[PDB]
Structures are given as C-alpha cells and as structure tokens.
C-alpha cells in the first residue's frame, strides 16, 4: 500500500512537469545518468522498493 | 508531492553526468536523423 501511494505520487510528479520526463525518456542502452538523476531526485524522500 | 527547484539541480546533474555514438532514426532521400551525439 505504501508502494502504491508513493508510485502514484511519483506519477503525479512526472505528470506535473514534462520537462523532467523528457530527460527521463531518452533512449540509451546504459541510462546510468538517468539512474543518477533517480538516485539524486527522490532518494531522500521515498522508500526502498 | 514535488520538492521545488531541486528539479533543475537534478536535470543539470543528468546533463553533466554524461567515444560518442549516435543512432539513426529516420532515413529517406539522402537525409538521415541521428539521435545521440550531444557534442557534435
């Protein structure tokens, strides 16, 4: 239930501003910069799973 | 919700965090489109 809550929160986030999703939906077989953005955008606010 | 204005911090973090190779997307009539190659 906390997973679902946090996921819909992330969904509302990625919906409210499309400019971040643009840098988040670029195609590249190694997205470790996008993974970094993940590790440095919500890591201090969300759970582990 | 959304913590404010750290979003641009993470955006530039992504930009700066990234031998460059692009990939063809479209090709027709002697004109191609290439995704990637941020430093051309």
Swiss-Prot record, chain B:
Q: What does this protein do?
A: Produces ATP from ADP in the presence of a proton gradient across the membrane. The alpha chain is a regulatory subunit.
Describe, as the record does, how this protein assembles with itself and its partners: F-type ATPases have 2 components, CF(1) - the catalytic core - and CF(0) - the membrane proton channel. CF(1) has five subunits: alpha(3), beta(3), gamma(1), delta(1), epsilon(1). CF(0) has three main subunits: a(1), b(2) and c(9-12). The alpha and beta chains form an alternating ring which encloses part of the gamma chain. CF(1) is attached to CF(0) by a central stalk formed by the gamma and epsilon chains, while a peripheral stalk is formed by the delta and b chains.
Which part of the complete protein is shown?
5 to 50 of 549
Q: What is this protein called?
A: ATP synthase subunit alpha
Q: Which domain of life is it from?
A: Bacteria
From the Swiss-Prot or TrEMBL record, state where the protein is found: Cell membrane
Family as reported in the entry's similarity comment: Belongs to the ATPase alpha/beta chains family.
Source gene?
A: atpA
């Amino acid at each position: 239930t906390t997973l679902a809550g946090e996921l819909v929160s992330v969904a509302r986030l990625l919906d409210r501003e499309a400019v971040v999703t643009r840098y988040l939906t670029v195609p590249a077989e190694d997205a470790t910069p996008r993974i970094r953005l993940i590790e440095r955008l919500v890591s201090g606010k969300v759970g582990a799973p | 919700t959304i913590p404010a204005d750290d979003i641009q911090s993470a955006i530039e973090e992504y930009v700066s965090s990234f031998e460059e190779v692009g990939t063809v997307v479209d090709a027709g009539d002697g004109i191609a489109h290439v995704e990637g190659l941020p430093s051309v």
